[PDB]
PDB file of all heavy atoms in Angstrom:
ATOM      1  N   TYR A   1       2.065  22.969  -2.689  1.00 39.88           N
ATOM      2  CA  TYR A   1       2.397  21.832  -3.518  1.00 39.88           C
ATOM      3  C   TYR A   1       3.110  22.297  -4.807  1.00 39.88           C
ATOM      4  O   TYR A   1       2.989  23.517  -5.118  1.00 39.88           O
ATOM      5  CB  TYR A   1       1.094  21.059  -3.821  1.00 39.88           C
ATOM      6  CG  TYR A   1       0.586  20.455  -2.521  1.00 39.88           C
ATOM      7  CD1 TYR A   1      -0.243  21.199  -1.687  1.00 39.88           C
ATOM      8  CD2 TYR A   1       1.044  19.277  -2.017  1.00 39.88           C
ATOM      9  CE1 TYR A   1      -0.715  20.696  -0.518  1.00 39.88           C
ATOM     10  CE2 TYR A   1       0.615  18.781  -0.854  1.00 39.88           C
ATOM     11  CZ  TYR A   1      -0.254  19.477  -0.055  1.00 39.88           C
ATOM     12  OH  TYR A   1      -0.603  19.028   1.161  1.00 39.88           O
ATOM     13  N   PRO A   2       3.916  21.499  -5.480  1.00 41.35           N
ATOM     14  CA  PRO A   2       4.077  20.061  -5.231  1.00 41.35           C
ATOM     15  C   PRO A   2       4.968  19.863  -4.063  1.00 41.35           C
ATOM     16  O   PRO A   2       5.815  20.711  -3.661  1.00 41.35           O
ATOM     17  CB  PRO A   2       4.688  19.605  -6.550  1.00 41.35           C
ATOM     18  CG  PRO A   2       5.442  20.779  -7.057  1.00 41.35           C
ATOM     19  CD  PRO A   2       4.653  21.954  -6.616  1.00 41.35           C
ATOM     20  N   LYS A   3       4.829  18.699  -3.449  1.00 41.24           N
ATOM     21  CA  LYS A   3       5.734  18.134  -2.418  1.00 41.24           C
ATOM     22  C   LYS A   3       6.348  16.900  -2.874  1.00 41.24           C
ATOM     23  O   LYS A   3       5.687  16.102  -3.554  1.00 41.24           O
ATOM     24  CB  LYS A   3       4.933  17.902  -1.064  1.00 41.24           C
ATOM     25  CG  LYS A   3       4.439  19.188  -0.490  1.00 41.24           C
ATOM     26  CD  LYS A   3       3.762  18.901   0.891  1.00 41.24           C
ATOM     27  CE  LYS A   3       3.136  20.137   1.571  1.00 41.24           C
ATOM     28  NZ  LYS A   3       2.621  19.890   2.866  1.00 41.24           N
ATOM     29  N   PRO A   4       7.602  16.620  -2.557  1.00 38.28           N
ATOM     30  CA  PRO A   4       8.301  15.452  -3.042  1.00 38.28           C
ATOM     31  C   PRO A   4       7.900  14.142  -2.541  1.00 38.28           C
ATOM     32  O   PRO A   4       8.163  13.085  -3.147  1.00 38.28           O
ATOM     33  CB  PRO A   4       9.749  15.766  -2.783  1.00 38.28           C
ATOM     34  CG  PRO A   4       9.695  16.710  -1.585  1.00 38.28           C
ATOM     35  CD  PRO A   4       8.512  17.550  -1.791  1.00 38.28           C
ATOM     36  N   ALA A   5       7.233  14.160  -1.370  1.00 39.29           N
ATOM     37  CA  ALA A   5       6.676  12.941  -0.757  1.00 39.29           C
ATOM     38  C   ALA A   5       5.291  13.330  -0.207  1.00 39.29           C
ATOM     39  O   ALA A   5       5.063  14.416   0.176  1.00 39.29           O
ATOM     40  CB  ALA A   5       7.542  12.459   0.349  1.00 39.29           C
ATOM     41  N   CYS A   6       4.403  12.322  -0.101  1.00 40.42           N
ATOM     42  CA  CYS A   6       3.161  12.407   0.530  1.00 40.42           C
ATOM     43  C   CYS A   6       3.105  11.330   1.640  1.00 40.42           C
ATOM     44  O   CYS A   6       3.656  10.312   1.446  1.00 40.42           O
ATOM     45  CB  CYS A   6       1.965  12.213  -0.465  1.00 40.42           C
ATOM     46  SG  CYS A   6       1.898  13.546  -1.678  1.00 40.42           S
ATOM     47  N   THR A   7       2.384  11.640   2.695  1.00 36.70           N
ATOM     48  CA  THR A   7       2.176  10.655   3.749  1.00 36.70           C
ATOM     49  C   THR A   7       1.140   9.607   3.394  1.00 36.70           C
ATOM     50  O   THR A   7       0.494   9.719   2.341  1.00 36.70           O
ATOM     51  CB  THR A   7       1.819  11.255   5.049  1.00 36.70           C
ATOM     52  OG1 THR A   7       0.413  11.692   5.003  1.00 36.70           O
ATOM     53  CG2 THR A   7       2.702  12.438   5.398  1.00 36.70           C
ATOM     54  N   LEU A   8       1.028   8.626   4.284  1.00 36.93           N
ATOM     55  CA  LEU A   8       0.103   7.552   4.170  1.00 36.93           C
ATOM     56  C   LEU A   8      -1.256   7.866   4.738  1.00 36.93           C
ATOM     57  O   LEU A   8      -2.046   6.941   4.892  1.00 36.93           O
ATOM     58  CB  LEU A   8       0.744   6.261   4.660  1.00 36.93           C
ATOM     59  CG  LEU A   8       1.942   5.768   3.901  1.00 36.93           C
ATOM     60  CD1 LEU A   8       2.415   4.412   4.463  1.00 36.93           C
ATOM     61  CD2 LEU A   8       1.594   5.598   2.425  1.00 36.93           C
ATOM     62  N   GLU A   9      -1.543   9.077   5.210  1.00 38.30           N
ATOM     63  CA  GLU A   9      -2.824   9.331   5.840  1.00 38.30           C
ATOM     64  C   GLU A   9      -3.930   9.298   4.706  1.00 38.30           C
ATOM     65  O   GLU A   9      -3.760   9.849   3.674  1.00 38.30           O
ATOM     66  CB  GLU A   9      -2.803  10.821   6.435  1.00 38.30           C
ATOM     67  CG  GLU A   9      -4.026  11.120   7.251  1.00 38.30           C
ATOM     68  CD  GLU A   9      -3.967  12.507   7.993  1.00 38.30           C
ATOM     69  OE1 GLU A   9      -2.823  13.058   8.187  1.00 38.30           O
ATOM     70  OE2 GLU A   9      -4.999  12.810   8.568  1.00 38.30           O
ATOM     71  N   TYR A  10      -4.878   8.377   4.920  1.00 40.80           N
ATOM     72  CA  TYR A  10      -5.873   8.134   3.847  1.00 40.80           C
ATOM     73  C   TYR A  10      -7.163   8.814   4.024  1.00 40.80           C
ATOM     74  O   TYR A  10      -7.946   8.533   4.951  1.00 40.80           O
ATOM     75  CB  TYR A  10      -6.187   6.644   3.779  1.00 40.80           C
ATOM     76  CG  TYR A  10      -7.036   6.214   2.596  1.00 40.80           C
ATOM     77  CD1 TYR A  10      -6.475   6.257   1.300  1.00 40.80           C
ATOM     78  CD2 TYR A  10      -8.389   5.947   2.687  1.00 40.80           C
ATOM     79  CE1 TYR A  10      -7.182   5.892   0.183  1.00 40.80           C
ATOM     80  CE2 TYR A  10      -9.132   5.622   1.565  1.00 40.80           C
ATOM     81  CZ  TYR A  10      -8.509   5.752   0.286  1.00 40.80           C
ATOM     82  OH  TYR A  10      -9.205   5.411  -0.857  1.00 40.80           O
ATOM     83  N   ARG A  11      -7.273   9.902   3.277  1.00 42.11           N
ATOM     84  CA  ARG A  11      -8.367  10.828   3.328  1.00 42.11           C
ATOM     85  C   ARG A  11      -8.891  11.149   1.927  1.00 42.11           C
ATOM     86  O   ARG A  11      -8.337  12.073   1.277  1.00 42.11           O
ATOM     87  CB  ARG A  11      -7.944  12.077   4.077  1.00 42.11           C
ATOM     88  CG  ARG A  11      -7.692  11.787   5.569  1.00 42.11           C
ATOM     89  CD  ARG A  11      -8.169  12.821   6.437  1.00 42.11           C
ATOM     90  NE  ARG A  11      -7.233  13.870   6.380  1.00 42.11           N
ATOM     91  CZ  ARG A  11      -7.138  14.881   7.198  1.00 42.11           C
ATOM     92  NH1 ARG A  11      -8.228  15.557   7.474  1.00 42.11           N
ATOM     93  NH2 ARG A  11      -5.990  15.483   7.150  1.00 42.11           N
ATOM     94  N   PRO A  12      -9.635  10.293   1.402  1.00 41.95           N
ATOM     95  CA  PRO A  12      -9.943  10.270  -0.034  1.00 41.95           C
ATOM     96  C   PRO A  12     -10.617  11.512  -0.593  1.00 41.95           C
ATOM     97  O   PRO A  12     -11.449  12.059   0.093  1.00 41.95           O
ATOM     98  CB  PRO A  12     -10.732   8.989  -0.190  1.00 41.95           C
ATOM     99  CG  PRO A  12     -11.295   8.629   1.066  1.00 41.95           C
ATOM    100  CD  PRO A  12     -10.306   9.121   2.056  1.00 41.95           C
ATOM    101  N   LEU A  13     -10.205  11.842  -1.788  1.00 42.83           N
ATOM    102  CA  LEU A  13     -10.921  12.912  -2.461  1.00 42.83           C
ATOM    103  C   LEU A  13     -10.977  12.612  -3.961  1.00 42.83           C
ATOM    104  O   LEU A  13     -10.116  11.961  -4.524  1.00 42.83           O
ATOM    105  CB  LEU A  13     -10.492  14.207  -2.027  1.00 42.83           C
ATOM    106  CG  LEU A  13      -9.130  14.599  -2.506  1.00 42.83           C
ATOM    107  CD1 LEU A  13      -8.828  16.062  -1.908  1.00 42.83           C
ATOM    108  CD2 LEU A  13      -7.966  13.768  -2.002  1.00 42.83           C
ATOM    109  N   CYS A  14     -12.054  12.979  -4.566  1.00 42.90           N
ATOM    110  CA  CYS A  14     -12.414  12.599  -5.853  1.00 42.90           C
ATOM    111  C   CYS A  14     -12.102  13.717  -6.854  1.00 42.90           C
ATOM    112  O   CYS A  14     -12.704  14.781  -6.838  1.00 42.90           O
ATOM    113  CB  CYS A  14     -13.923  12.282  -5.964  1.00 42.90           C
ATOM    114  SG  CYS A  14     -14.417  11.778  -7.629  1.00 42.90           S
ATOM    115  N   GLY A  15     -11.139  13.378  -7.760  1.00 44.99           N
ATOM    116  CA  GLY A  15     -10.805  14.323  -8.789  1.00 44.99           C
ATOM    117  C   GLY A  15     -11.804  14.468  -9.923  1.00 44.99           C
ATOM    118  O   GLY A  15     -12.635  13.547 -10.075  1.00 44.99           O
ATOM    119  N   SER A  16     -11.722  15.501 -10.687  1.00 45.56           N
ATOM    120  CA  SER A  16     -12.552  15.761 -11.818  1.00 45.56           C
ATOM    121  C   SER A  16     -12.315  14.658 -12.943  1.00 45.56           C
ATOM    122  O   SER A  16     -13.020  14.555 -13.969  1.00 45.56           O
ATOM    123  CB  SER A  16     -12.370  17.120 -12.401  1.00 45.56           C
ATOM    124  OG  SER A  16     -11.056  17.331 -12.734  1.00 45.56           O
ATOM    125  N   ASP A  17     -11.187  13.870 -12.787  1.00 45.68           N
ATOM    126  CA  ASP A  17     -10.864  12.778 -13.647  1.00 45.68           C
ATOM    127  C   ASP A  17     -11.495  11.389 -13.157  1.00 45.68           C
ATOM    128  O   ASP A  17     -11.240  10.328 -13.792  1.00 45.68           O
ATOM    129  CB  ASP A  17      -9.358  12.595 -13.657  1.00 45.68           C
ATOM    130  CG  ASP A  17      -8.662  12.454 -12.299  1.00 45.68           C
ATOM    131  OD1 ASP A  17      -9.344  12.486 -11.315  1.00 45.68           O
ATOM    132  OD2 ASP A  17      -7.432  12.320 -12.276  1.00 45.68           O
ATOM    133  N   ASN A  18     -12.322  11.458 -12.098  1.00 45.60           N
ATOM    134  CA  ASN A  18     -12.898  10.291 -11.456  1.00 45.60           C
ATOM    135  C   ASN A  18     -11.864   9.323 -10.908  1.00 45.60           C
ATOM    136  O   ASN A  18     -12.181   8.183 -10.628  1.00 45.60           O
ATOM    137  CB  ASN A  18     -13.921   9.599 -12.359  1.00 45.60           C
ATOM    138  CG  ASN A  18     -15.307  10.222 -12.289  1.00 45.60           C
ATOM    139  OD1 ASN A  18     -15.663  10.687 -11.258  1.00 45.60           O
ATOM    140  ND2 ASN A  18     -16.033  10.185 -13.380  1.00 45.60           N
ATOM    141  N   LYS A  19     -10.699   9.820 -10.553  1.00 45.47           N
ATOM    142  CA  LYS A  19      -9.745   9.088  -9.736  1.00 45.47           C
ATOM    143  C   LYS A  19     -10.018   9.537  -8.239  1.00 45.47           C
ATOM    144  O   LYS A  19     -10.098  10.683  -7.986  1.00 45.47           O
ATOM    145  CB  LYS A  19      -8.320   9.358 -10.113  1.00 45.47           C
ATOM    146  CG  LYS A  19      -7.292   8.778  -9.158  1.00 45.47           C
ATOM    147  CD  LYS A  19      -5.911   8.830  -9.724  1.00 45.47           C
ATOM    148  CE  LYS A  19      -4.806   8.431  -8.738  1.00 45.47           C
ATOM    149  NZ  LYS A  19      -3.440   8.457  -9.357  1.00 45.47           N
ATOM    150  N   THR A  20     -10.020   8.534  -7.365  1.00 44.28           N
ATOM    151  CA  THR A  20     -10.040   8.772  -5.947  1.00 44.28           C
ATOM    152  C   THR A  20      -8.622   8.842  -5.451  1.00 44.28           C
ATOM    153  O   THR A  20      -7.961   7.847  -5.301  1.00 44.28           O
ATOM    154  CB  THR A  20     -10.831   7.693  -5.147  1.00 44.28           C
ATOM    155  OG1 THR A  20     -12.168   7.633  -5.611  1.00 44.28           O
ATOM    156  CG2 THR A  20     -10.799   8.020  -3.652  1.00 44.28           C
ATOM    157  N   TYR A  21      -8.146  10.085  -5.200  1.00 41.43           N
ATOM    158  CA  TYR A  21      -6.806  10.292  -4.670  1.00 41.43           C
ATOM    159  C   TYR A  21      -6.774   9.991  -3.161  1.00 41.43           C
ATOM    160  O   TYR A  21      -7.772  10.144  -2.481  1.00 41.43           O
ATOM    161  CB  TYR A  21      -6.425  11.787  -4.938  1.00 41.43           C
ATOM    162  CG  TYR A  21      -6.238  12.075  -6.404  1.00 41.43           C
ATOM    163  CD1 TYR A  21      -7.341  12.371  -7.257  1.00 41.43           C
ATOM    164  CD2 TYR A  21      -4.978  11.946  -6.909  1.00 41.43           C
ATOM    165  CE1 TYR A  21      -7.061  12.530  -8.573  1.00 41.43           C
ATOM    166  CE2 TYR A  21      -4.768  12.093  -8.261  1.00 41.43           C
ATOM    167  CZ  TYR A  21      -5.800  12.373  -9.117  1.00 41.43           C
ATOM    168  OH  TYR A  21      -5.577  12.486 -10.420  1.00 41.43           O
ATOM    169  N   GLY A  22      -5.601   9.467  -2.719  1.00 38.77           N
ATOM    170  CA  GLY A  22      -5.535   9.033  -1.380  1.00 38.77           C
ATOM    171  C   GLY A  22      -5.545  10.072  -0.301  1.00 38.77           C
ATOM    172  O   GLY A  22      -5.873   9.778   0.841  1.00 38.77           O
ATOM    173  N   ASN A  23      -5.131  11.287  -0.636  1.00 36.84           N
ATOM    174  CA  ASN A  23      -5.120  12.366   0.307  1.00 36.84           C
ATOM    175  C   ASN A  23      -4.838  13.688  -0.476  1.00 36.84           C
ATOM    176  O   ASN A  23      -4.605  13.598  -1.704  1.00 36.84           O
ATOM    177  CB  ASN A  23      -4.134  12.216   1.450  1.00 36.84           C
ATOM    178  CG  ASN A  23      -2.748  11.979   1.073  1.00 36.84           C
ATOM    179  OD1 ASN A  23      -2.210  12.553   0.092  1.00 36.84           O
ATOM    180  ND2 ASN A  23      -1.994  11.228   1.852  1.00 36.84           N
ATOM    181  N   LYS A  24      -4.931  14.841   0.221  1.00 35.30           N
ATOM    182  CA  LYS A  24      -4.752  16.084  -0.427  1.00 35.30           C
ATOM    183  C   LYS A  24      -3.425  16.282  -1.061  1.00 35.30           C
ATOM    184  O   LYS A  24      -3.305  16.857  -2.117  1.00 35.30           O
ATOM    185  CB  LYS A  24      -4.993  17.251   0.592  1.00 35.30           C
ATOM    186  CG  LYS A  24      -4.796  18.586  -0.013  1.00 35.30           C
ATOM    187  CD  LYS A  24      -4.889  19.733   0.920  1.00 35.30           C
ATOM    188  CE  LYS A  24      -4.644  21.075   0.291  1.00 35.30           C
ATOM    189  NZ  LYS A  24      -4.599  22.190   1.215  1.00 35.30           N
ATOM    190  N   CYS A  25      -2.391  15.681  -0.464  1.00 37.24           N
ATOM    191  CA  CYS A  25      -1.032  15.736  -1.029  1.00 37.24           C
ATOM    192  C   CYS A  25      -0.984  15.100  -2.414  1.00 37.24           C
ATOM    193  O   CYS A  25      -0.495  15.703  -3.407  1.00 37.24           O
ATOM    194  CB  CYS A  25      -0.053  15.169  -0.065  1.00 37.24           C
ATOM    195  SG  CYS A  25       1.666  15.223  -0.586  1.00 37.24           S
ATOM    196  N   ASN A  26      -1.443  13.939  -2.519  1.00 36.86           N
ATOM    197  CA  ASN A  26      -1.525  13.220  -3.770  1.00 36.86           C
ATOM    198  C   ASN A  26      -2.355  13.934  -4.807  1.00 36.86           C
ATOM    199  O   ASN A  26      -1.925  14.119  -5.980  1.00 36.86           O
ATOM    200  CB  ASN A  26      -1.948  11.792  -3.634  1.00 36.86           C
ATOM    201  CG  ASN A  26      -0.779  10.888  -3.057  1.00 36.86           C
ATOM    202  OD1 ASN A  26       0.307  10.869  -3.553  1.00 36.86           O
ATOM    203  ND2 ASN A  26      -0.979  10.530  -1.817  1.00 36.86           N
ATOM    204  N   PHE A  27      -3.546  14.417  -4.393  1.00 36.44           N
ATOM    205  CA  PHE A  27      -4.353  15.240  -5.317  1.00 36.44           C
ATOM    206  C   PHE A  27      -3.628  16.507  -5.785  1.00 36.44           C
ATOM    207  O   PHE A  27      -3.621  16.823  -6.978  1.00 36.44           O
ATOM    208  CB  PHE A  27      -5.649  15.575  -4.580  1.00 36.44           C
ATOM    209  CG  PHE A  27      -6.545  16.520  -5.361  1.00 36.44           C
ATOM    210  CD1 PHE A  27      -7.234  16.149  -6.482  1.00 36.44           C
ATOM    211  CD2 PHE A  27      -6.518  17.810  -5.011  1.00 36.44           C
ATOM    212  CE1 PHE A  27      -7.958  17.007  -7.255  1.00 36.44           C
ATOM    213  CE2 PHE A  27      -7.296  18.770  -5.814  1.00 36.44           C
ATOM    214  CZ  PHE A  27      -7.977  18.332  -6.884  1.00 36.44           C
ATOM    215  N   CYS A  28      -3.152  17.280  -4.867  1.00 37.26           N
ATOM    216  CA  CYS A  28      -2.519  18.547  -5.228  1.00 37.26           C
ATOM    217  C   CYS A  28      -1.311  18.330  -6.145  1.00 37.26           C
ATOM    218  O   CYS A  28      -1.023  19.129  -7.065  1.00 37.26           O
ATOM    219  CB  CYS A  28      -2.171  19.446  -4.093  1.00 37.26           C
ATOM    220  SG  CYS A  28      -3.566  20.228  -3.240  1.00 37.26           S
ATOM    221  N   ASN A  29      -0.506  17.325  -5.834  1.00 36.18           N
ATOM    222  CA  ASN A  29       0.594  17.015  -6.735  1.00 36.18           C
ATOM    223  C   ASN A  29       0.115  16.710  -8.156  1.00 36.18           C
ATOM    224  O   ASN A  29       0.737  17.129  -9.076  1.00 36.18           O
ATOM    225  CB  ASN A  29       1.421  15.804  -6.190  1.00 36.18           C
ATOM    226  CG  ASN A  29       2.460  16.197  -5.167  1.00 36.18           C
ATOM    227  OD1 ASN A  29       2.669  17.331  -4.847  1.00 36.18           O
ATOM    228  ND2 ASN A  29       3.058  15.178  -4.610  1.00 36.18           N
ATOM    229  N   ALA A  30      -1.014  15.980  -8.265  1.00 40.65           N
ATOM    230  CA  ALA A  30      -1.630  15.729  -9.557  1.00 40.65           C
ATOM    231  C   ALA A  30      -2.147  17.005 -10.190  1.00 40.65           C
ATOM    232  O   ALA A  30      -2.074  17.132 -11.432  1.00 40.65           O
ATOM    233  CB  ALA A  30      -2.717  14.684  -9.416  1.00 40.65           C
ATOM    234  N   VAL A  31      -2.701  17.934  -9.464  1.00 41.04           N
ATOM    235  CA  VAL A  31      -3.116  19.191  -9.970  1.00 41.04           C
ATOM    236  C   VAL A  31      -2.014  19.934 -10.639  1.00 41.04           C
ATOM    237  O   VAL A  31      -2.095  20.405 -11.775  1.00 41.04           O
ATOM    238  CB  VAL A  31      -3.784  20.079  -8.896  1.00 41.04           C
ATOM    239  CG1 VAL A  31      -4.060  21.518  -9.400  1.00 41.04           C
ATOM    240  CG2 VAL A  31      -5.117  19.476  -8.401  1.00 41.04           C
ATOM    241  N   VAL A  32      -0.892  19.999  -9.961  1.00 41.24           N
ATOM    242  CA  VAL A  32       0.318  20.602 -10.530  1.00 41.24           C
ATOM    243  C   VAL A  32       0.735  19.853 -11.796  1.00 41.24           C
ATOM    244  O   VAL A  32       1.094  20.493 -12.743  1.00 41.24           O
ATOM    245  CB  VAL A  32       1.498  20.747  -9.474  1.00 41.24           C
ATOM    246  CG1 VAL A  32       2.667  21.308 -10.098  1.00 41.24           C
ATOM    247  CG2 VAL A  32       0.950  21.588  -8.277  1.00 41.24           C
ATOM    248  N   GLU A  33       0.842  18.532 -11.698  1.00 42.93           N
ATOM    249  CA  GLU A  33       1.288  17.743 -12.852  1.00 42.93           C
ATOM    250  C   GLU A  33       0.372  17.957 -14.096  1.00 42.93           C
ATOM    251  O   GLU A  33       0.831  17.967 -15.220  1.00 42.93           O
ATOM    252  CB  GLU A  33       1.215  16.220 -12.528  1.00 42.93           C
ATOM    253  CG  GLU A  33       1.757  15.389 -13.603  1.00 42.93           C
ATOM    254  CD  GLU A  33       1.757  14.017 -13.346  1.00 42.93           C
ATOM    255  OE1 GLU A  33       1.206  13.602 -12.352  1.00 42.93           O
ATOM    256  OE2 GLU A  33       2.094  13.343 -14.332  1.00 42.93           O
ATOM    257  N   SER A  34      -0.929  18.129 -13.823  1.00 40.26           N
ATOM    258  CA  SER A  34      -1.903  18.377 -14.932  1.00 40.26           C
ATOM    259  C   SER A  34      -1.867  19.783 -15.526  1.00 40.26           C
ATOM    260  O   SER A  34      -2.699  20.082 -16.376  1.00 40.26           O
ATOM    261  CB  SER A  34      -3.272  18.095 -14.360  1.00 40.26           C
ATOM    262  OG  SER A  34      -3.791  19.243 -13.643  1.00 40.26           O
ATOM    263  N   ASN A  35      -0.983  20.671 -15.006  1.00 41.56           N
ATOM    264  CA  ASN A  35      -0.961  22.042 -15.443  1.00 41.56           C
ATOM    265  C   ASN A  35      -2.226  22.755 -15.164  1.00 41.56           C
ATOM    266  O   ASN A  35      -2.785  23.511 -15.942  1.00 41.56           O
ATOM    267  CB  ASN A  35      -0.497  22.138 -16.977  1.00 41.56           C
ATOM    268  CG  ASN A  35       0.904  21.592 -17.155  1.00 41.56           C
ATOM    269  OD1 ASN A  35       1.794  21.869 -16.367  1.00 41.56           O
ATOM    270  ND2 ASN A  35       1.092  20.806 -18.150  1.00 41.56           N
TER     271      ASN A  35
END
C-alpha cells in the first residue's frame, strides 16, 4: 500500500482511531495517510 483503488470486499477492521475500516486496503491506505 498505498493502492489507488480499493475493492468492495467488506471485511471490517478496527483502527486505533475507533473507525471501522471496510477492508484491509482502506485501512492500509489510511495507515500511509496517517504517516
Side-chain angles (χ1 to χ4, degrees):
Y1 295 87
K3 294 184 182 184
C6 296
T7 75
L8 298 180
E9 190 174 336
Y10 188 68
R11 290 219 283 193
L13 71 180
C14 179
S16 61
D17 55 0
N18 277 327
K19 173 167 172 178
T20 302
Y21 289 88
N23 56 40
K24 181 186 177 187
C25 181
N26 283 307
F27 172 73
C28 287
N29 276 355
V31 171
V32 178
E33 183 175 11
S34 85
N35 297 318

